[PDB]
Amino acid sequence: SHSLRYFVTAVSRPPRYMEVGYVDNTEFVRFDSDAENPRYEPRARWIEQEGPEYWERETRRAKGNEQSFRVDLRTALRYYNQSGSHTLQWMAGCDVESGRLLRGYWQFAYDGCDYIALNEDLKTWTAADMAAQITRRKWEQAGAAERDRAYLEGECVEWLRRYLKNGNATLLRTDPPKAHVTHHRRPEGDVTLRCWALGFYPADITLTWQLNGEELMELVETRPAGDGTFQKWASVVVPLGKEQKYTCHVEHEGLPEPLTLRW
């Protein structure tokens, strides 16, 4: 399946406003209030084809969003009895199989913490606390969920489909992980094995160590390589002389066959 997602942040400062858009794990647009002439801008080649009307509609939506988020920030201050800087984050996204909407998201956090989220039914809200219950009641009364659903099932699906056509050359690729194991004897006398997956796209991957058929492990987060691809590693500490009993297993949509690696 594929997703189209917007990640939005507003930050009060003793207010900066940013939007980023992604298809799957590729950023394709960005808006930043602190720019000299703030406007929506391309971050992938394939979106530059779009006409002037695309950019101006997007810029104007961003600017309206900015104003809504300034009110949001101010209101949240009141609900929580605060005086400092504060962040409101929003994510809105559709996940589509090949036209059916697998899953829709429309959710917010305040100061890094869950605030409110549209449920999987795309009809009801989950509020994190009694402040967020005030929003949930107002949004119930305004029919917010119906309009948010119509975006997620309508415009979001139709635009993802156009992006996937526009950027087909880059968006439909699957870059397999190139994997290897490194070995490091520790001054404590035992051995660190680390299983690396490099150069893969998309970001989703499974990386695990096994011993004698049983899953085991420090595992890092998928980190960007900077060129559109991802990296990940997983580590185990193993007794000296026992390295060969350990196998690293990697699965990723881009692979003819799951990888099994050993030192």
Binding site: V29, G64, N65, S68, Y79, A92, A144, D148
Partner: peptide, 9 residues
């Protein structure tokens, strides 16, 4: 095109 957060907190 993209999403509008019309409804305020």
């Amino acid at each position: 095109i993209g999403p509008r957060a019309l409804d305020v907190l």
